[PDB]
Design an enzyme around this catalytic site. Structure first.
Site, mmCIF file in Angstrom:
data_model
loop_
_atom_site.group_PDB
_atom_site.id
_atom_site.type_symbol
_atom_site.label_atom_id
_atom_site.label_comp_id
_atom_site.label_asym_id
_atom_site.label_seq_id
_atom_site.Cartn_x
_atom_site.Cartn_y
_atom_site.Cartn_z
ATOM 1 N N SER A 95 -49.209 79.553 19.078
ATOM 2 C CA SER A 95 -50.665 79.348 18.758
ATOM 3 C C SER A 95 -50.850 77.798 18.458
ATOM 4 O O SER A 95 -50.446 76.927 19.243
ATOM 5 C CB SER A 95 -50.953 80.317 17.454
ATOM 6 O OG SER A 95 -51.960 80.147 16.635
ATOM 7 N N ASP A 216 -53.636 88.746 26.077
ATOM 8 C CA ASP A 216 -53.659 87.983 24.815
ATOM 9 C C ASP A 216 -55.115 87.634 24.577
ATOM 10 O O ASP A 216 -55.711 86.928 25.404
ATOM 11 C CB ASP A 216 -52.773 86.762 24.982
ATOM 12 C CG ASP A 216 -52.719 85.887 23.747
ATOM 13 O OD1 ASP A 216 -53.721 85.848 23.040
ATOM 14 O OD2 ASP A 216 -51.659 85.251 23.520
ATOM 15 N N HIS A 245 -51.132 88.899 21.082
ATOM 16 C CA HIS A 245 -51.051 87.469 20.779
ATOM 17 C C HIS A 245 -49.873 87.122 19.862
ATOM 18 O O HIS A 245 -49.556 85.951 19.725
ATOM 19 C CB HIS A 245 -52.360 87.018 20.172
ATOM 20 C CG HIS A 245 -52.445 85.520 19.926
ATOM 21 N ND1 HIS A 245 -52.227 84.570 20.892
ATOM 22 C CD2 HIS A 245 -52.856 84.832 18.868
ATOM 23 C CE1 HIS A 245 -52.465 83.375 20.453
ATOM 24 N NE2 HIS A 245 -52.833 83.498 19.219
HETATM 25 C C1 LIG Z 1 -59.338 82.903 18.681
HETATM 26 C C2 LIG Z 1 -59.753 82.917 17.224
HETATM 27 C C3 LIG Z 1 -58.906 82.318 16.325
HETATM 28 N N1 LIG Z 1 -57.783 81.722 16.806
HETATM 29 C C4 LIG Z 1 -57.089 80.617 16.418
HETATM 30 C C5 LIG Z 1 -57.645 79.692 15.550
HETATM 31 C C6 LIG Z 1 -56.903 78.615 15.133
HETATM 32 C C7 LIG Z 1 -55.623 78.424 15.613
HETATM 33 C C8 LIG Z 1 -55.099 79.295 16.531
HETATM 34 C C9 LIG Z 1 -55.809 80.419 16.938
HETATM 35 C C10 LIG Z 1 -55.146 81.369 17.848
HETATM 36 O O1 LIG Z 1 -55.739 82.324 18.334
HETATM 37 O O2 LIG Z 1 -53.867 81.236 18.056
HETATM 38 C C11 LIG Z 1 -59.185 82.323 14.976
HETATM 39 C C12 LIG Z 1 -60.359 82.873 14.491
HETATM 40 C C13 LIG Z 1 -61.167 83.506 15.432
HETATM 41 C C14 LIG Z 1 -60.872 83.547 16.788
HETATM 42 N N2 LIG Z 1 -61.730 84.217 17.710
HETATM 43 O O3 LIG Z 1 -61.137 85.046 18.642
HETATM 44 O O4 LIG Z 1 -63.084 84.250 17.634
#
Ligand SMILES: Cc1c(Nc2ccccc2C(=O)O)cccc1[N+](=O)[O-]
Length: 266
Positions: A95, A216, A245
């Site tokens: 991530s 993912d 993921h």
């Molecule tokens: C994709 C996501 C994330 N994702 C990250 C945020 C920061 C670092 C890595 C990630 C990651 O998915 O690895 C956090 C909160 C909300 C959502 N979303 O799906 O709306």
């Protein structure tokens, strides 16, 4: 240096001349590696640490100004490796740590002999002729939810991120997501969503293994292909035969096979 090793909970386990850094992602800490770790420690010296945003780190170390770009997380990684006197390693990043490892490998090509990227993307937001998986309006709403009711947000998010119906993994990811301070969690998300690594991928010189699962929520299949096309080192994609993921939580034995192969020579 020294203080940093304490603040970020640095642990060195195993032994070997092949040094491996395991660097966790959003919503977890280094405990997310616990089930893959025994597959590595007979063969490798393994460095683990917590990102400054992890709930297992005292949140009063989180400086919102300093950590409004990923370069500051890179600085922490490099400071830890320099304090440990490690001249060369492989780096496994999930991530946000995949993004950190890409940047670190550009800053210090001498230090990063190989990268293994899990759940990785150079850019989450869609653009003209780039599909990242997310739209601005979508993420605006999520960021509002994260602030309005962090607990309800996290409860809903954990099973989506895990993907596969693996209740123990949902519970474990939830445990650490609930441990993140809400304002810190939102700030890391904002910081990551404003990051765009596309232009620097060709500066990576290290060989890279991109681990991609069969679905993912954060990483469309076409993003893995983009990374293989644009990263500057010899790059391959290894497809796990499960979804999610967080395969280190949901399918650690399968992920460990890929890691053993990727970490054999470098
Ligand atoms: C994709 C996501 C994330 N994702 C990250 C945020 C920061 C670092 C890595 C990630 C990651 O998915 O690895 C956090 C909160 C909300 C959502 N979303 O799906 O709306």
């Amino acid at each position: 240096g020294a203080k940093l090793l304490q603040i970020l909970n640095v642990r060195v386990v195993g032994s070997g001349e092949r040094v491996v850094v395991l660097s966790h992602g959003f919503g977890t800490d280094q405990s997310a590696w616990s089930r893959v770790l025994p597959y590595l420690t007979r063969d490798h010296r393994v460095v683990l640490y917590d990102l400054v945003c992890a709930g297992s780190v005292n949140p009063d170390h989180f400086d919102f100004r300093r950590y409004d770009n990923l370069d500051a997380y890179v600085d922490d990684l490099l400071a830890i490796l320099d304090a440990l006197r490690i001249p060369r390693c492989a780096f496994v990043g999930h991530s946000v740590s995949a993004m950190i490892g890409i940047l670190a490998s550009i800053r210090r090509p001498d230090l990063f002999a190989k990268l293994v990227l899990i759940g990785a993307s150079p850019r989450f937001l869609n653009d003209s002729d780039y599909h990242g998986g997310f739209e601005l309006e979508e993420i605006q709403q999520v960021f509002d939810a994260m602030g309005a009711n962090y607990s309800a947000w996290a409860t809903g998010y954990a099973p989506l991120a895990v993907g596969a119906d693996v209740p123990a993994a949902v519970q474990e990811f939830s445990r650490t997501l609930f441990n993140m301070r809400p304002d810190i969690s939102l700030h890391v998300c904002q910081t990551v969503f404003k990051t765009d690594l596309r232009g620097v991928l060709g500066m990576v010189r290290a060989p890279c293994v991109v681990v991609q699962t069969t679905r993912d929520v954060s990483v469309p299949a076409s993003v893995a292909a983009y990374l293989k096309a644009h990263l500057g080192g010899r790059t391959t994609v290894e497809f796990l035969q499960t979804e999610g993921h967080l395969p280190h939580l949901s399918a650690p034995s399968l992920l460990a096979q890929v890691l053993r192969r990727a970490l054999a020579r470098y």
